[PDB]
Structures are given as structure tokens and as C-alpha cells.
Design an enzyme around this catalytic site. Sequence first.
Site: not given
Lengths: 340, 341
Positions: B43-45, B86, B191, B232, B242-243
Site C-alpha cells: 500500500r502507499g500511493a 484500487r 497503517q 492519495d 487522503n486516508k
Amino acid sequence: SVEWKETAITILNQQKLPDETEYLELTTKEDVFDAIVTLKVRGAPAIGITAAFGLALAAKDIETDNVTEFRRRLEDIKQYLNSSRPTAINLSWALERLSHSVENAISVNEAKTNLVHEAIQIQVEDEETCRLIGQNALQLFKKGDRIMTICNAGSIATSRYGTALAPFYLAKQKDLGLHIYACETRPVLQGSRLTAWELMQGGIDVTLITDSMAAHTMKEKQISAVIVGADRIAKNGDTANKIGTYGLAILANAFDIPFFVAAPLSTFDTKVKCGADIPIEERDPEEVRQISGVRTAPSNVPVFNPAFDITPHDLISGIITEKGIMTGNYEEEIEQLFKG
Amino acid sequence: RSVEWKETAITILNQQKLPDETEYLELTTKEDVFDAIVTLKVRGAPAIGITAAFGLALAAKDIETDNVTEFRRRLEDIKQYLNSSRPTAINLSWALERLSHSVENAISVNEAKTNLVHEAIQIQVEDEETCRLIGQNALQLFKKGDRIMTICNAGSIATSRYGTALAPFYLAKQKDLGLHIYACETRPVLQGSRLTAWELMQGGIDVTLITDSMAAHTMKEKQISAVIVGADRIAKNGDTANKIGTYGLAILANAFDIPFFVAAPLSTFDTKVKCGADIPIEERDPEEVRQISGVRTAPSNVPVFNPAFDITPHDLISGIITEKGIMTGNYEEEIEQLFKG
């Protein structure tokens, strides 16, 4: 959740839900101390109630005939059960109720049957205040609106119906298509483990969300209002509730959405000026580092673990008790309210 | 390291295993890439794009075609397959769009077949340098001995290395300045307590964990000086995606009047939208909110709402930090007078 047997107290182990419905037979003044610190039983009122049956029980165990001495020991126990958990008054409030119910007892044997009636009585009027809060608060919402809440101020946090969940239960019959949004109140997840289980177990329209989603849900689900219980309310009007409550209030105010605090009269502390001077309990760091034996963060990562935050009366649209709805100027309203 | 390209296999760190485990995986199939990404093993943009890219290139391997346009012809089926992994992060789009554009004027199947790998390496390293640049760019925003709060895990394993929001902390450690960062666990996937708390600890970074429900109180009690997160996808007007959880930290922040900052590489941008409200907010599997690492926390069957990201409207952001510098005011134009090239 709290049931008294003149020999012991059987409590629903709240730690286990929603997985198992276990019942424990607390019989020792130390079994109660633990049940509280350990959260086997939680909810300001339910907690006050068991605190009382606690002294009421450890007392028969007290041997002697000197009423003056009896009351010396009795006090050591009370200071012990009281040292259990701070932040909510319902604990020491019920304890006071009892240690005063015997300030003029002639003998001991009576003073022992005294304490019990008091405790058994404290629990009876809890059903009554809750049924009332359920009915006084419902006036606030209408058919259709979606309301948010936190922690678990329901049936097992009290005696029955509860405080902030009470109206839901009532809105049910009325067939008010009330749609609730309950947050999993971390770390102890009193919301997903208790509030979701309970409301579902009763056919209420609940929807579980992480604490974070609070704001996103307010915007994309058009939340109509917010109601929560309490653990301590100051003369000022500032209220102490589950960690997270404050965030929802300031966050709610941004969406110009109604913030209600449903709480019994026993949850008020007249002696205290404002909220900032209400002691906040910080619990075990591990509550944030693992769950049910499964680690969720570096074992030694430093943590800040407060159990409650404070919501300034500036953020509260209204307060609900068994008496009614004081929608503002809670400073005065209370002095009026309070009497006896 | 975060994402490692071999020439016949991609080696990713299984992020769902942390913090108690550091196991790695050998992705070989576009099937393997798709999974890892969707099941958050990665994960992580940026890391996401680094993988989607590399992955795509590993895909364009086992595909026979004398023809160039026949290779391209079916070469989207792959792009599309992965792009459908995603939605939210605009980096997976951007990173596939690049690879598919650098084979446009390709004269041979082997040319592209080989240009792709070079492109996917071009992308990873580029990131490092831009993470290193945002780090420095953002460090100017904090004095020393101040308490910053973040959310999610926008660090070195989310990016090629250094990170975007965490970058400034590694750098502060360097210049040795009393930074105390406060990481919210960031549920449902966690996360924060799982990825962030773990790396910042490795790097001896002063960190303190709090559940998401402690933002407000920590802000008052602890006197946190600033807030920093990492997009993101950013909209043509400042609106950052964002998250989930970021939108409130923004609202709360505003209420306590402390600077809220976004750290995102230029790629994390999406100029082709007029605002965030138009940004696809991914919604993940409900059983994500119904438990914690196998432990059932709520009654299964309990209806859940599970958005992976929210939107913090630009007029809540005190400043956006990129590899090119800081933006503090009219973001719409600044953002415009930047992608100019």
C-alpha cells in the site's frame, strides 16, 4: 447486567461480548474491585450500582458489634472500591449514598440490612431515570433522521434502556425509522462490541463505523444529531465522557449538527467548577498495543491512553436528564435543578 | 526495501504481516500484483504505483507478438486489469498511464517489452529524489521540540524511501531537532500503529501512539504544534483526498488553530478534476471494520460503513508541500502554474 444475590453479585462479563455471554459470581470485595478496573462491568451507572452492592456485600462479612467500629472498617472498604476507577462520580456517589444511609443506625445488623436496601434501591430508580431519559430525549428527533453516538451508554451500562440509547429503544415501537450510526469506541471497542451487539439484539437500525469516519459520515450521510452519555458533569456544564466524545462535539459543531449529552442526575458533580478540573483516567498502554492476545503495534511503542475527554458546554446543544431538557445556560439551570 | 524489481520477479514486503513479522513475497503474475495491491500486502500511493508499473512490465513479458500494435493492442487489458485494483490513489493511474505512453512510438515488441522495465525503474528512483525533496521542503515548517500529529503511514515503505509526510522527521532526526510525532493508529487497516509506529521506531524517531479517537484531546492536553498527512489524490483546487480520518484532523486542526499540511509528490496530483467531491472514494470489505487482526470485535452481520479515504477541502489546508516547494494560498492557480510543464 448487574443482579444481586444476598450471597453474591452475578455480572455479565462485558469483556467477552459480542463473542460470549458469560456471567461471573463476584463474592469478594476484591472480586468487585477487579471487575471494575478490569472493565468486566462498565458504564458510570452500572458501575455505581455494583460499587454499592459491593459494600453491601463485604459488609455482612464484617464482624463485630461496635457500630462505631463497624463504620471505621466500612469506610476502608468504601475508599478501596472508590479507588478503583475515578473519572465517573456514579461510583463514589453511590458509595456516599450508602455510608450516609447508616449515619444514624442504632445497631449493626440493621445498618447491614440498611446498606442493602439502599443498594437494591439505587438500582430500582435507575430503571426509572433511564426510562425517563429515553422519553425526554426522543422529543429531540423525528421520523427519518440518522443519529450518531459513541461508547456504549445502553442497557448494560445502566440497568435497563440506558441513557443515550434509551430513545432508540423507544423510537422503535413508535416505528420512528431512526437510523443509528454507532462508532467502535477504541481502544476498548465498547461501541462495536456492546453498542452494535445490543442495538442489533433489539432490532434497531445500527451501522458500525470506525471512530475516524466520524466526519466523513457526517457529510455523506447527512447526520441529523449526536447523542452521548456521560461519566461526570460539572456545575459549569462541561461534560466528561468516553475518549472521543469531545472530538465529535467540536466536529459536530462544524457541521452545525446538534450535540446532546444524555445523563442521569447522579452523573452531576456540583462540587466541581468546570470540566478542566475533572480527573481523567489513563489506562494500561497495552489497551492500544494489542487486542485479545494479538499485538497491533510495536510492543514498546509509547502511548497516550486517556479514557475520557472533556466537552465544553459551549459545544452542547442540550442536556437530558430524568427532569427534562436544559438547552443552555447550564450553569444556572443546574443550581435550579439541584435541590435537597 | 519497500518494492524490489528483479528482472523476472517483484519482491514486496508483506505489509499486512507487520509489525510482528517481516516476510517478503515473490510476485510473478499480474494476478499476484493485483492481489497484493487489493489485499494491502502493498500500500502507499507511490509504492502502489511503483508496483503496478513494474508489474505491468513483468506482464508484457510472457506475451508473444511479432507485431507492435498487437502487443499494445492487448497491452491495456493488463493496464486495465491492474488499474481496476484500487480507485482512490491517482498514482496507480498515473504510473500506468506513463508506461503505456512510453511505448507509443515503439518500433519493436522487444523495444517496448524492454522500454517498460526502464520506465518502471525511472519511476521508482525519481520518487526517492522527490521524497528527499519534499522532506527538506517540509522541514522548514517546524521549529524544534514540537509535537506533530500524522495519520496513516506515508513513509519509506509507502514510497520508494524517505516518504512524504514522514520524510521531514527522518531529516529532523538528522539535524537533530526535538521532534515528537504523534501517530494515530488509523483504523480500520491500522497503517498507523502497524506501519508508522514501527518504522519511526526503527529510525529512533520520537513517536507516541494514540487511537484516532484522541485527536482532539491530545491536541489540547499535549499542545501539538502542527499536523501533517499525505494525499492519495489532489484536485485542481487544493481539495486533497487522503486516508479516511484526515478530514476530521483537518476540521479539528482548524478548530484548535494549528497548521494542517499535505505532503504529496507532483504525481499524487490530478488536475483533470474540479474538486475532490468528484474523486472516487474506494470502499473496502466490511469485515475490515468488524474485527482486528482476526479478532472479531463486533457481531458479524452488523452493517458497516467503510470508506478508505475522505476529503479535506482546500480551505482547511494550511499548506501543501511538493518536490517543487510549498504552497500556502490560492492553490487552484499555484497548482495550475506548476504543471505548466
